[PDB]
Ligand binder design. Structure first.
Ligand SMILES: OC[C@H]1O[C@@H](O[C@H]2[C@H](O)[C@@H](O)[C@H](O[C@H]3[C@H](O)[C@@H](O)[C@H](O[C@H]4[C@H](O)[C@@H](O)[C@H](O[C@H]5[C@H](O)[C@@H](O)[C@H](O)O[C@@H]5CO)O[C@@H]4CO)O[C@@H]3CO)O[C@@H]2CO)[C@H](O)[C@@H](O)[C@@H]1O
Ligand SMILES: *[C@@H]1O[C@H](CO)[C@@H](O)[C@H](O)[C@H]1NC(C)=O
Ligand SMILES: [Cl-]
Ligand SMILES: [Cl-]
Ligand SMILES: [Cl-]
Ligand SMILES: [Cu+2]
Ligand code: NA
Length: 235
C-alpha cells in the first residue's frame, strides 16, 4: 500500500502533487486485475490541472508514501521491482504507447529488492528525462509487490501480484529531440498471467532468479536510481 506524494526536479521539491500533477487514486489500494483499464494510471485516470516543467537531462524524482509523507513508505513485506514508463499525454495512456525508462528488480551485491531500497531512500526514485520532443508526457511509476504473487489473480482473486501505479503529468520544455519516442506497449495488455515476473514465489525461489516483466528498457533511456535526493522534513 503506497502512493506518490509529488516529484522533485534536479533535487528541488515541486510541492504536493496529489490530484494536481499526479492522477492520484482515492487511496493506496493495489491494482491486481491485469486486464483492467485501472492498469493504465490506476483507478482515477483523468487530466489533472498542472504539469511539471522539465528539460531533457533533468533528474525527475518520484516520492512515494504510505499514510503520511516520509513515513514507512510501503510495508516491508512488499518485496518486488520498480519500473518507470513514459507516454505522450495526448494518448491518455491508451494504445501501444508506453516506453520503459527504468527497471530495477533485485540487486545481487546489496541483496535488496528495489522496494527495500525505496524504503531506505524515503520513498524516492529517479529517472533522467530523455531527449524526446518537447511537449506533454505521462510518466507512469509502477511498483510490483510480490508477497502474494505465487498465485495469479485471475485464478484466485484474493491473491496475486499487486501493482501500485502512479501517473505524473510532465511537460518537457527544452530538448534537442535527438531520440524521438518510439511506440511502446499497452497497459492494460503488456502483462499477462504467463509474462515472466508476474507469478513468482519469493519465499522459495531465490531472488537472483527473478526476471522482471518486459518490455526491456528503451536505449534512449538515461538511467535512474533509487536514492534520496531531498529531505522532505526540511520543507
Ligand atoms: O504463499 C507463499 C508464502 O506465503 C508467506 O506468507 C505471506 C502471505 O502469503 C501473505 O498473504 C502475507 O500478506 C500480508 C502482508 O505481509 C501485509 O504487509 C499486508 O498488510 C496490508 C493489509 O492487508 C492491509 O489491510 C493494509 O491496508 C491499510 C493501508 O496500509 C493503510 O494505509 C490504509 O489507511 O488502511 C488500509 C486498511 O487498514 O495494508 C497493509 C500493508 O500496508 O497484508 C497481507 C495480506 O494479509 O504476507 C506473508 C508474508 O509476510 C509464507 O510466509 C510462506 O510460508 C509461503 O511460502
Ligand atoms: C478484470 O478486468 C476486466 C476488464 O475491465 C473485467 O471485465 C473483469 O471482470 C475483471 N475481473 C475481475 C475479477 O474483476
Ligand atoms: Cl496486501
Ligand atoms: Cl500529508
Ligand atoms: Cl501496515
Ligand atoms: Cu500493500
Ligand atoms: Na511551483
Amino acid at each position: 500500500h503506497t502512493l506518490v506524494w509529488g516529484v522533485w526536479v534536479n533535487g528541488v521539491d515541486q510541492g504536493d502533487g496529489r490530484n494536481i500533477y499526479i492522477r492520484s487514486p482515492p487511496n493506496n489500494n493495489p491494482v491486481k486485475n491485469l486486464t483492467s483499464p485501472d492498469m493504465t494510471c490506476n483507478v482515477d485516470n483523468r487530466v489533472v490541472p498542472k504539469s511539471v516543467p522539465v528539460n531533457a537531462g533533468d533528474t525527475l524524482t518520484f516520492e512515494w508514501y504510505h499514510n503520511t509523507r516520509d513515513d514507512d513508505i510501503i510495508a516491508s513485506s512488499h518485496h518486488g521491482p520498480i519500473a518507470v514508463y513514459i507516454a505522450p499525454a495526448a494518448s491518455n495512456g491508451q494504445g501501444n504507447v508506453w516506453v520503459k525508462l527504468f527497471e530495477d528488480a533485485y540487486n545481487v551485491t546489496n541483496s535488496t529488492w528495489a522496494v527495500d531500497r525505496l524504503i531506505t531512500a524515503h520513498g524516492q526514485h529517479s529517472v533522467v528525462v530523455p531527449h524526446v520532443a518537447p511537449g506533454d508526457y505521462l510518466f507512469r511509476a509502477e511498483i510490483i509487490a510480490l508477497h502474494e504473487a505465487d498465485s495469479l489473480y485471475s485464478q484466485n482473486p484474493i491473491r496475486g501480484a499487486q501493482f501500485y501505479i502512479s501517473c505524473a503529468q510532465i511537460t518537457i520544455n527544452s530538448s534537442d529531440d535527438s531520440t524521438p519516442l518510439p511506440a511502446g506497449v499497452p497497459f492494460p495488455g503488456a502483462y499477462t498471467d504467463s509474462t515472466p515476473g508476474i507469478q513468482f514465489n519469493i519465499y522459495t525461489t531465490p531472488a537472483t532468479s527473478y526476471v522482471a516483466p518486459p518490455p526491456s528498457v528503451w536505449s534512449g533511456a538515461l538511467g535512474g536510481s533509487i536514492a534520496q535526493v531531498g529531505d522532505a522534513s526540511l520543507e
